[PDB]
PDB file of N, CA and C and ligand atoms in Angstrom:
ATOM      1  N   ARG J   1       0.844  -1.212   0.000  1.00 12.14           N
ATOM      2  CA  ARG J   1       0.000   0.000   0.000  1.00 12.14           C
ATOM      3  C   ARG J   1       0.871   1.251   0.000  1.00 12.14           C
ATOM      4  N   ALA J   2       0.352   2.338  -0.567  1.00 11.68           N
ATOM      5  CA  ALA J   2       1.077   3.600  -0.623  1.00 11.68           C
ATOM      6  C   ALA J   2       1.402   4.092   0.763  1.00 11.68           C
ATOM      7  N   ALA J   3       0.546   3.782   1.714  1.00 12.88           N
ATOM      8  CA  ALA J   3       0.772   4.205   3.085  1.00 12.88           C
ATOM      9  C   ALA J   3       1.955   3.488   3.697  1.00 12.88           C
ATOM     10  N   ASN J   4       2.412   2.426   3.057  1.00 11.60           N
ATOM     11  CA  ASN J   4       3.612   1.710   3.485  1.00 11.60           C
ATOM     12  C   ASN J   4       4.781   2.092   2.573  1.00 11.60           C
ATOM     13  N   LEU J   5       4.488   2.235   1.272  1.00 11.03           N
ATOM     14  CA  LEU J   5       5.510   2.591   0.291  1.00 11.03           C
ATOM     15  C   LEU J   5       5.906   4.055   0.417  1.00 11.03           C
ATOM     16  N   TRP J   6       5.149   4.802   1.207  1.00 10.31           N
ATOM     17  CA  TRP J   6       5.464   6.200   1.491  1.00 10.31           C
ATOM     18  C   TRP J   6       6.420   6.230   2.695  1.00 10.31           C
ATOM     19  N   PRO J   7       6.050   5.565   3.817  1.00 11.03           N
ATOM     20  CA  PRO J   7       6.919   5.418   4.996  1.00 11.03           C
ATOM     21  C   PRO J   7       8.303   4.882   4.650  1.00 11.03           C
ATOM     22  N   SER J   8       8.375   4.014   3.645  1.00 10.21           N
ATOM     23  CA  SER J   8       9.652   3.446   3.228  1.00 10.21           C
ATOM     24  C   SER J   8      10.646   4.560   2.823  1.00 10.21           C
ATOM     25  N   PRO J   9      10.344   5.408   1.804  1.00 12.22           N
ATOM     26  CA  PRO J   9      11.224   6.532   1.437  1.00 12.22           C
ATOM     27  C   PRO J   9      11.498   7.451   2.624  1.00 12.22           C
ATOM     28  N   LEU J  10      10.506   7.607   3.494  1.00  8.04           N
ATOM     29  CA  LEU J  10      10.663   8.440   4.679  1.00  8.04           C
ATOM     30  C   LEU J  10      11.707   7.826   5.606  1.00  8.04           C
ATOM     31  N   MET J  11      11.753   6.497   5.617  1.00  6.33           N
ATOM     32  CA  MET J  11      12.724   5.760   6.415  1.00  6.33           C
ATOM     33  C   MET J  11      14.113   6.007   5.836  1.00  6.33           C
ATOM     34  N   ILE J  12      14.153   6.173   4.521  1.00  5.53           N
ATOM     35  CA  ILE J  12      15.395   6.475   3.824  1.00  5.53           C
ATOM     36  C   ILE J  12      15.814   7.897   4.185  1.00  5.53           C
ATOM     37  N   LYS J  13      14.816   8.766   4.312  1.00  5.55           N
ATOM     38  CA  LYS J  13      15.036  10.153   4.692  1.00  5.55           C
ATOM     39  C   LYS J  13      15.624  10.202   6.097  1.00  5.55           C
ATOM     40  N   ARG J  14      15.085   9.369   6.985  1.00  6.71           N
ATOM     41  CA  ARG J  14      15.565   9.293   8.360  1.00  6.71           C
ATOM     42  C   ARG J  14      17.024   8.854   8.359  1.00  6.71           C
ATOM     43  N   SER J  15      17.339   7.907   7.486  1.00  7.50           N
ATOM     44  CA  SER J  15      18.697   7.401   7.362  1.00  7.50           C
ATOM     45  C   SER J  15      19.626   8.512   6.871  1.00  7.50           C
ATOM     46  N   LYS J  16      19.127   9.323   5.945  1.00  4.79           N
ATOM     47  CA  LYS J  16      19.900  10.437   5.405  1.00  4.79           C
ATOM     48  C   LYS J  16      20.075  11.515   6.473  1.00  4.79           C
ATOM     49  N   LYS J  17      19.057  11.678   7.307  1.00  7.46           N
ATOM     50  CA  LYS J  17      19.090  12.661   8.385  1.00  7.46           C
ATOM     51  C   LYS J  17      20.150  12.259   9.410  1.00  7.46           C
ATOM     52  N   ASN J  18      20.379  10.956   9.496  1.00  7.20           N
ATOM     53  CA  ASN J  18      21.373  10.399  10.400  1.00  7.20           C
ATOM     54  C   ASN J  18      22.743  10.410   9.738  1.00  7.20           C
ATOM     55  N   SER J  19      22.762  10.159   8.441  1.00  8.95           N
ATOM     56  CA  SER J  19      23.991  10.154   7.669  1.00  8.95           C
ATOM     57  C   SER J  19      24.228  11.535   7.052  1.00  8.95           C
TER      58      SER J  19
ATOM     59  N   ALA K   1       3.221  22.250  30.387  1.00  6.24           N
ATOM     60  CA  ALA K   1       2.941  21.043  29.572  1.00  6.24           C
ATOM     61  C   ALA K   1       3.968  20.908  28.452  1.00  6.24           C
ATOM     62  N   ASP K   2       3.728  19.969  27.549  1.00  4.69           N
ATOM     63  CA  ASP K   2       4.629  19.736  26.425  1.00  4.69           C
ATOM     64  C   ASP K   2       4.219  20.591  25.234  1.00  4.69           C
ATOM     65  N   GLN K   3       4.030  21.882  25.476  1.00  4.02           N
ATOM     66  CA  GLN K   3       3.616  22.801  24.426  1.00  4.02           C
ATOM     67  C   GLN K   3       4.705  22.928  23.368  1.00  4.02           C
ATOM     68  N   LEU K   4       5.926  23.217  23.803  1.00  2.62           N
ATOM     69  CA  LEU K   4       7.044  23.351  22.881  1.00  2.62           C
ATOM     70  C   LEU K   4       7.722  22.002  22.689  1.00  2.62           C
ATOM     71  N   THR K   5       7.103  21.154  21.883  1.00  3.24           N
ATOM     72  CA  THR K   5       7.637  19.832  21.613  1.00  3.24           C
ATOM     73  C   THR K   5       8.740  19.892  20.573  1.00  3.24           C
ATOM     74  N   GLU K   6       8.351  19.867  19.299  1.00  3.19           N
ATOM     75  CA  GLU K   6       9.312  19.904  18.201  1.00  3.19           C
ATOM     76  C   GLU K   6      10.336  18.781  18.366  1.00  3.19           C
ATOM     77  N   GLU K   7       9.828  17.564  18.455  1.00  5.49           N
ATOM     78  CA  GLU K   7      10.660  16.387  18.641  1.00  5.49           C
ATOM     79  C   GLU K   7      10.541  15.460  17.429  1.00  5.49           C
ATOM     80  N   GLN K   8       9.303  15.137  17.084  1.00  3.68           N
ATOM     81  CA  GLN K   8       9.007  14.280  15.958  1.00  3.68           C
ATOM     82  C   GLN K   8       8.658  15.129  14.758  1.00  3.68           C
ATOM     83  N   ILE K   9       7.999  16.255  15.036  1.00  6.20           N
ATOM     84  CA  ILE K   9       7.582  17.201  14.005  1.00  6.20           C
ATOM     85  C   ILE K   9       8.766  17.696  13.183  1.00  6.20           C
ATOM     86  N   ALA K  10       9.948  17.692  13.791  1.00  3.61           N
ATOM     87  CA  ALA K  10      11.164  18.131  13.114  1.00  3.61           C
ATOM     88  C   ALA K  10      11.506  17.202  11.953  1.00  3.61           C
ATOM     89  N   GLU K  11      11.056  15.961  12.050  1.00  3.93           N
ATOM     90  CA  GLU K  11      11.319  14.970  11.022  1.00  3.93           C
ATOM     91  C   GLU K  11      10.299  15.049   9.897  1.00  3.93           C
ATOM     92  N   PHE K  12       9.138  15.634  10.184  1.00  6.87           N
ATOM     93  CA  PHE K  12       8.092  15.783   9.179  1.00  6.87           C
ATOM     94  C   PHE K  12       8.488  16.886   8.209  1.00  6.87           C
ATOM     95  N   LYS K  13       9.043  17.958   8.760  1.00  6.38           N
ATOM     96  CA  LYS K  13       9.491  19.090   7.965  1.00  6.38           C
ATOM     97  C   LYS K  13      10.695  18.699   7.118  1.00  6.38           C
ATOM     98  N   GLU K  14      11.387  17.655   7.552  1.00  3.27           N
ATOM     99  CA  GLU K  14      12.554  17.170   6.838  1.00  3.27           C
ATOM    100  C   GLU K  14      12.144  16.534   5.517  1.00  3.27           C
ATOM    101  N   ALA K  15      10.923  16.021   5.465  1.00  2.00           N
ATOM    102  CA  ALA K  15      10.424  15.394   4.254  1.00  2.00           C
ATOM    103  C   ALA K  15      10.396  16.414   3.122  1.00  2.00           C
ATOM    104  N   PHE K  16       9.855  17.589   3.402  1.00  2.00           N
ATOM    105  CA  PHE K  16       9.760  18.653   2.397  1.00  2.00           C
ATOM    106  C   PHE K  16      11.123  19.300   2.130  1.00  2.00           C
ATOM    107  N   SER K  17      12.156  18.773   2.768  1.00  2.00           N
ATOM    108  CA  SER K  17      13.502  19.305   2.607  1.00  2.00           C
ATOM    109  C   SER K  17      14.424  18.317   1.888  1.00  2.00           C
ATOM    110  N   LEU K  18      14.225  17.030   2.141  1.00  3.34           N
ATOM    111  CA  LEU K  18      15.058  15.992   1.537  1.00  3.34           C
ATOM    112  C   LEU K  18      14.330  15.249   0.419  1.00  3.34           C
ATOM    113  N   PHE K  19      13.008  15.210   0.487  1.00  2.16           N
ATOM    114  CA  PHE K  19      12.226  14.505  -0.518  1.00  2.16           C
ATOM    115  C   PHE K  19      11.999  15.374  -1.757  1.00  2.16           C
ATOM    116  N   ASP K  20      11.559  16.611  -1.549  1.00  2.61           N
ATOM    117  CA  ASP K  20      11.293  17.524  -2.662  1.00  2.61           C
ATOM    118  C   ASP K  20      12.520  18.374  -2.982  1.00  2.61           C
ATOM    119  N   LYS K  21      12.766  18.579  -4.272  1.00  2.00           N
ATOM    120  CA  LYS K  21      13.895  19.382  -4.723  1.00  2.00           C
ATOM    121  C   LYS K  21      13.423  20.492  -5.649  1.00  2.00           C
ATOM    122  N   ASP K  22      12.112  20.605  -5.841  1.00  2.00           N
ATOM    123  CA  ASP K  22      11.572  21.635  -6.714  1.00  2.00           C
ATOM    124  C   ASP K  22      11.289  22.898  -5.916  1.00  2.00           C
ATOM    125  N   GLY K  23      10.998  22.721  -4.640  1.00  2.36           N
ATOM    126  CA  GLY K  23      10.697  23.847  -3.787  1.00  2.36           C
ATOM    127  C   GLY K  23       9.212  24.051  -3.662  1.00  2.36           C
ATOM    128  N   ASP K  24       8.478  22.962  -3.808  1.00  5.08           N
ATOM    129  CA  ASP K  24       7.028  23.000  -3.736  1.00  5.08           C
ATOM    130  C   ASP K  24       6.534  22.532  -2.373  1.00  5.08           C
ATOM    131  N   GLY K  25       7.276  21.619  -1.764  1.00  6.36           N
ATOM    132  CA  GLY K  25       6.900  21.102  -0.462  1.00  6.36           C
ATOM    133  C   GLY K  25       5.657  20.237  -0.529  1.00  6.36           C
ATOM    134  N   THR K  26       5.539  19.474  -1.605  1.00  6.04           N
ATOM    135  CA  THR K  26       4.409  18.587  -1.804  1.00  6.04           C
ATOM    136  C   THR K  26       4.888  17.266  -2.391  1.00  6.04           C
ATOM    137  N   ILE K  27       4.160  16.193  -2.139  1.00  6.12           N
ATOM    138  CA  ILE K  27       4.543  14.895  -2.666  1.00  6.12           C
ATOM    139  C   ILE K  27       3.700  14.530  -3.881  1.00  6.12           C
ATOM    140  N   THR K  28       4.340  14.502  -5.039  1.00  6.80           N
ATOM    141  CA  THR K  28       3.673  14.132  -6.271  1.00  6.80           C
ATOM    142  C   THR K  28       4.342  12.890  -6.839  1.00  6.80           C
ATOM    143  N   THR K  29       3.860  12.437  -7.980  1.00 10.50           N
ATOM    144  CA  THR K  29       4.425  11.277  -8.656  1.00 10.50           C
ATOM    145  C   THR K  29       5.925  11.446  -8.914  1.00 10.50           C
ATOM    146  N   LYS K  30       6.347  12.698  -9.104  1.00 10.85           N
ATOM    147  CA  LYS K  30       7.745  13.014  -9.380  1.00 10.85           C
ATOM    148  C   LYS K  30       8.657  12.669  -8.212  1.00 10.85           C
ATOM    149  N   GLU K  31       8.273  13.047  -6.993  1.00  8.90           N
ATOM    150  CA  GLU K  31       9.110  12.798  -5.825  1.00  8.90           C
ATOM    151  C   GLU K  31       8.931  11.368  -5.315  1.00  8.90           C
ATOM    152  N   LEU K  32       7.776  10.808  -5.595  1.00  8.21           N
ATOM    153  CA  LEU K  32       7.456   9.450  -5.165  1.00  8.21           C
ATOM    154  C   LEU K  32       8.264   8.422  -5.966  1.00  8.21           C
ATOM    155  N   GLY K  33       8.526   8.731  -7.232  1.00  7.52           N
ATOM    156  CA  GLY K  33       9.265   7.812  -8.082  1.00  7.52           C
ATOM    157  C   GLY K  33      10.764   8.041  -8.076  1.00  7.52           C
ATOM    158  N   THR K  34      11.192   9.280  -7.855  1.00  4.42           N
ATOM    159  CA  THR K  34      12.618   9.607  -7.868  1.00  4.42           C
ATOM    160  C   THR K  34      13.403   8.839  -6.807  1.00  4.42           C
ATOM    161  N   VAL K  35      12.833   8.701  -5.611  1.00  4.84           N
ATOM    162  CA  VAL K  35      13.508   7.988  -4.536  1.00  4.84           C
ATOM    163  C   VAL K  35      13.624   6.490  -4.867  1.00  4.84           C
ATOM    164  N   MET K  36      12.519   5.879  -5.295  1.00  6.92           N
ATOM    165  CA  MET K  36      12.512   4.455  -5.652  1.00  6.92           C
ATOM    166  C   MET K  36      13.472   4.190  -6.809  1.00  6.92           C
ATOM    167  N   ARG K  37      13.530   5.148  -7.728  1.00  7.41           N
ATOM    168  CA  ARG K  37      14.391   5.069  -8.904  1.00  7.41           C
ATOM    169  C   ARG K  37      15.855   4.865  -8.518  1.00  7.41           C
ATOM    170  N   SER K  38      16.259   5.435  -7.392  1.00 12.58           N
ATOM    171  CA  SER K  38      17.632   5.309  -6.930  1.00 12.58           C
ATOM    172  C   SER K  38      17.707   4.474  -5.654  1.00 12.58           C
ATOM    173  N   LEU K  39      16.717   3.616  -5.462  1.00 10.63           N
ATOM    174  CA  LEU K  39      16.669   2.764  -4.282  1.00 10.63           C
ATOM    175  C   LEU K  39      16.538   1.297  -4.670  1.00 10.63           C
ATOM    176  N   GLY K  40      15.594   0.999  -5.559  1.00 13.58           N
ATOM    177  CA  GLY K  40      15.380  -0.374  -5.994  1.00 13.58           C
ATOM    178  C   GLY K  40      14.735  -0.446  -7.360  1.00 13.58           C
ATOM    179  N   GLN K  41      15.230   0.392  -8.269  1.00 11.57           N
ATOM    180  CA  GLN K  41      14.736   0.471  -9.642  1.00 11.57           C
ATOM    181  C   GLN K  41      13.354   1.120  -9.694  1.00 11.57           C
ATOM    182  N   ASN K  42      13.126   1.902 -10.735  1.00 10.80           N
ATOM    183  CA  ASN K  42      11.862   2.603 -10.909  1.00 10.80           C
ATOM    184  C   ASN K  42      10.858   1.732 -11.654  1.00 10.80           C
ATOM    185  N   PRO K  43       9.617   1.654 -11.146  1.00 12.30           N
ATOM    186  CA  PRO K  43       8.547   0.881 -11.783  1.00 12.30           C
ATOM    187  C   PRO K  43       8.015   1.591 -13.024  1.00 12.30           C
ATOM    188  N   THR K  44       7.006   1.020 -13.661  1.00 13.25           N
ATOM    189  CA  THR K  44       6.437   1.627 -14.854  1.00 13.25           C
ATOM    190  C   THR K  44       5.508   2.784 -14.483  1.00 13.25           C
ATOM    191  N   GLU K  45       5.166   3.611 -15.466  1.00  8.28           N
ATOM    192  CA  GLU K  45       4.294   4.761 -15.245  1.00  8.28           C
ATOM    193  C   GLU K  45       2.954   4.324 -14.662  1.00  8.28           C
ATOM    194  N   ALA K  46       2.427   3.218 -15.174  1.00  8.29           N
ATOM    195  CA  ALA K  46       1.155   2.685 -14.700  1.00  8.29           C
ATOM    196  C   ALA K  46       1.229   2.348 -13.216  1.00  8.29           C
ATOM    197  N   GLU K  47       2.313   1.689 -12.835  1.00 13.89           N
ATOM    198  CA  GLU K  47       2.543   1.304 -11.448  1.00 13.89           C
ATOM    199  C   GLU K  47       2.676   2.536 -10.552  1.00 13.89           C
ATOM    200  N   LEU K  48       3.297   3.583 -11.080  1.00 12.57           N
ATOM    201  CA  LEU K  48       3.489   4.809 -10.327  1.00 12.57           C
ATOM    202  C   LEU K  48       2.166   5.547 -10.179  1.00 12.57           C
ATOM    203  N   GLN K  49       1.371   5.514 -11.237  1.00 12.09           N
ATOM    204  CA  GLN K  49       0.060   6.155 -11.238  1.00 12.09           C
ATOM    205  C   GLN K  49      -0.819   5.560 -10.149  1.00 12.09           C
ATOM    206  N   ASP K  50      -0.822   4.240 -10.077  1.00 12.18           N
ATOM    207  CA  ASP K  50      -1.619   3.526  -9.089  1.00 12.18           C
ATOM    208  C   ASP K  50      -1.136   3.836  -7.681  1.00 12.18           C
ATOM    209  N   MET K  51       0.178   3.972  -7.534  1.00 14.19           N
ATOM    210  CA  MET K  51       0.785   4.243  -6.238  1.00 14.19           C
ATOM    211  C   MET K  51       0.354   5.588  -5.660  1.00 14.19           C
ATOM    212  N   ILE K  52       0.373   6.651  -6.466  1.00 13.80           N
ATOM    213  CA  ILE K  52      -0.026   7.967  -5.971  1.00 13.80           C
ATOM    214  C   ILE K  52      -1.544   8.013  -5.761  1.00 13.80           C
ATOM    215  N   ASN K  53      -2.261   7.180  -6.505  1.00 14.80           N
ATOM    216  CA  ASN K  53      -3.713   7.093  -6.392  1.00 14.80           C
ATOM    217  C   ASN K  53      -4.085   6.338  -5.119  1.00 14.80           C
ATOM    218  N   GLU K  54      -3.132   5.552  -4.640  1.00 14.75           N
ATOM    219  CA  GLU K  54      -3.313   4.747  -3.442  1.00 14.75           C
ATOM    220  C   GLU K  54      -3.034   5.567  -2.182  1.00 14.75           C
ATOM    221  N   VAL K  55      -2.544   6.785  -2.366  1.00 15.19           N
ATOM    222  CA  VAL K  55      -2.239   7.655  -1.235  1.00 15.19           C
ATOM    223  C   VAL K  55      -3.085   8.932  -1.273  1.00 15.19           C
ATOM    224  N   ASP K  56      -3.122   9.587  -2.424  1.00 15.27           N
ATOM    225  CA  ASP K  56      -3.884  10.815  -2.569  1.00 15.27           C
ATOM    226  C   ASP K  56      -5.372  10.507  -2.650  1.00 15.27           C
ATOM    227  N   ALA K  57      -6.068  10.707  -1.541  1.00 16.43           N
ATOM    228  CA  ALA K  57      -7.495  10.442  -1.475  1.00 16.43           C
ATOM    229  C   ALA K  57      -8.309  11.656  -1.897  1.00 16.43           C
ATOM    230  N   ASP K  58      -7.638  12.782  -2.093  1.00 17.98           N
ATOM    231  CA  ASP K  58      -8.314  14.008  -2.499  1.00 17.98           C
ATOM    232  C   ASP K  58      -8.602  14.006  -4.002  1.00 17.98           C
ATOM    233  N   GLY K  59      -7.779  13.301  -4.761  1.00 18.82           N
ATOM    234  CA  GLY K  59      -8.003  13.188  -6.189  1.00 18.82           C
ATOM    235  C   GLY K  59      -7.274  14.220  -7.029  1.00 18.82           C
ATOM    236  N   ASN K  60      -6.003  14.456  -6.734  1.00 21.87           N
ATOM    237  CA  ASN K  60      -5.211  15.412  -7.501  1.00 21.87           C
ATOM    238  C   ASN K  60      -3.762  14.948  -7.630  1.00 21.87           C
ATOM    239  N   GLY K  61      -3.390  13.934  -6.855  1.00 22.92           N
ATOM    240  CA  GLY K  61      -2.034  13.409  -6.917  1.00 22.92           C
ATOM    241  C   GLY K  61      -1.029  14.309  -6.229  1.00 22.92           C
ATOM    242  N   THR K  62      -1.496  15.082  -5.265  1.00 24.19           N
ATOM    243  CA  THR K  62      -0.631  15.988  -4.537  1.00 24.19           C
ATOM    244  C   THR K  62      -0.963  15.981  -3.048  1.00 24.19           C
ATOM    245  N   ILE K  63       0.080  15.916  -2.229  1.00 23.31           N
ATOM    246  CA  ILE K  63      -0.073  15.931  -0.782  1.00 23.31           C
ATOM    247  C   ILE K  63       0.649  17.136  -0.186  1.00 23.31           C
ATOM    248  N   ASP K  64      -0.115  17.993   0.476  1.00 22.27           N
ATOM    249  CA  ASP K  64       0.430  19.181   1.109  1.00 22.27           C
ATOM    250  C   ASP K  64       0.724  18.901   2.585  1.00 22.27           C
ATOM    251  N   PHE K  65       1.094  19.940   3.318  1.00 25.36           N
ATOM    252  CA  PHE K  65       1.405  19.823   4.738  1.00 25.36           C
ATOM    253  C   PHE K  65       0.229  19.224   5.524  1.00 25.36           C
ATOM    254  N   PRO K  66      -1.005  19.793   5.403  1.00 26.79           N
ATOM    255  CA  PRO K  66      -2.192  19.272   6.101  1.00 26.79           C
ATOM    256  C   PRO K  66      -2.424  17.784   5.819  1.00 26.79           C
ATOM    257  N   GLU K  67      -2.157  17.362   4.584  1.00 31.54           N
ATOM    258  CA  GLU K  67      -2.339  15.963   4.199  1.00 31.54           C
ATOM    259  C   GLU K  67      -1.248  15.093   4.818  1.00 31.54           C
ATOM    260  N   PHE K  68      -0.017  15.569   4.713  1.00 28.90           N
ATOM    261  CA  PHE K  68       1.145  14.862   5.238  1.00 28.90           C
ATOM    262  C   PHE K  68       1.018  14.639   6.740  1.00 28.90           C
ATOM    263  N   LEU K  69       0.459  15.630   7.430  1.00 28.17           N
ATOM    264  CA  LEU K  69       0.272  15.560   8.875  1.00 28.17           C
ATOM    265  C   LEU K  69      -0.603  14.378   9.277  1.00 28.17           C
ATOM    266  N   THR K  70      -1.518  13.996   8.403  1.00 29.37           N
ATOM    267  CA  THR K  70      -2.405  12.881   8.681  1.00 29.37           C
ATOM    268  C   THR K  70      -1.867  11.587   8.068  1.00 29.37           C
ATOM    269  N   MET K  71      -1.283  11.714   6.879  1.00 31.24           N
ATOM    270  CA  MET K  71      -0.731  10.577   6.148  1.00 31.24           C
ATOM    271  C   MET K  71       0.371   9.868   6.935  1.00 31.24           C
ATOM    272  N   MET K  72       1.321  10.634   7.452  1.00 29.51           N
ATOM    273  CA  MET K  72       2.441  10.061   8.195  1.00 29.51           C
ATOM    274  C   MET K  72       2.125   9.920   9.683  1.00 29.51           C
ATOM    275  N   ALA K  73       0.847   9.798  10.009  1.00 32.46           N
ATOM    276  CA  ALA K  73       0.434   9.654  11.396  1.00 32.46           C
ATOM    277  C   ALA K  73      -0.557   8.501  11.565  1.00 32.46           C
ATOM    278  N   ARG K  74      -1.435   8.323  10.581  1.00 28.58           N
ATOM    279  CA  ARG K  74      -2.447   7.275  10.633  1.00 28.58           C
ATOM    280  C   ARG K  74      -1.892   5.927  10.167  1.00 28.58           C
ATOM    281  N   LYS K  75      -0.921   5.405  10.906  1.00 27.91           N
ATOM    282  CA  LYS K  75      -0.310   4.121  10.578  1.00 27.91           C
ATOM    283  C   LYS K  75      -1.263   2.976  10.916  1.00 27.91           C
ATOM    284  N   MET K  76      -1.330   1.984  10.036  1.00 27.95           N
ATOM    285  CA  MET K  76      -2.193   0.821  10.250  1.00 27.95           C
ATOM    286  C   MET K  76      -1.656  -0.035  11.395  1.00 27.95           C
ATOM    287  N   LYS K  77      -2.448  -0.993  11.855  1.00 27.24           N
ATOM    288  CA  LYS K  77      -2.030  -1.863  12.948  1.00 27.24           C
ATOM    289  C   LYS K  77      -1.192  -3.017  12.423  1.00 27.24           C
ATOM    290  N   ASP K  78      -1.266  -3.243  11.124  1.00 26.50           N
ATOM    291  CA  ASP K  78      -0.510  -4.309  10.500  1.00 26.50           C
ATOM    292  C   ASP K  78       0.685  -3.723   9.768  1.00 26.50           C
ATOM    293  N   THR K  79       1.813  -4.401   9.869  1.00 28.79           N
ATOM    294  CA  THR K  79       3.032  -3.948   9.227  1.00 28.79           C
ATOM    295  C   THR K  79       3.414  -4.877   8.079  1.00 28.79           C
ATOM    296  N   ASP K  80       3.815  -4.293   6.960  1.00 31.09           N
ATOM    297  CA  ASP K  80       4.205  -5.070   5.789  1.00 31.09           C
ATOM    298  C   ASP K  80       5.714  -5.316   5.793  1.00 31.09           C
TER     299      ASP K  80
HETATM  300 CA1   CA M 101       8.407  18.800  -5.906  1.00 29.77          CA
HETATM  301 CA1   CA M 102      -3.759  15.169  -1.908  1.00 25.42          CA
END
């Protein structure tokens, strides 16, 4: 679902925020 | 009270900073596919169309701040 496939990129964003 | 939080909300504003590069601060098919494109290959246009249609319930393919505030908060009880 988009509501999961949206959180996924956001999780990548979180990783970038950390990196 | 916890009036001045800015703990999790700081990460929401980050979306419109790291996800969008046009300066619109909205999530469209363009930003939705660009990340996947450099993450695990980009799907077809049809697949992308369905994906934004699966999120944008307003019927325009665009998510603003008010939408994002609810979208990234109303998580289901089941995890994929
Ligand atoms: Ca944009
Ligand atoms: Ca929308």
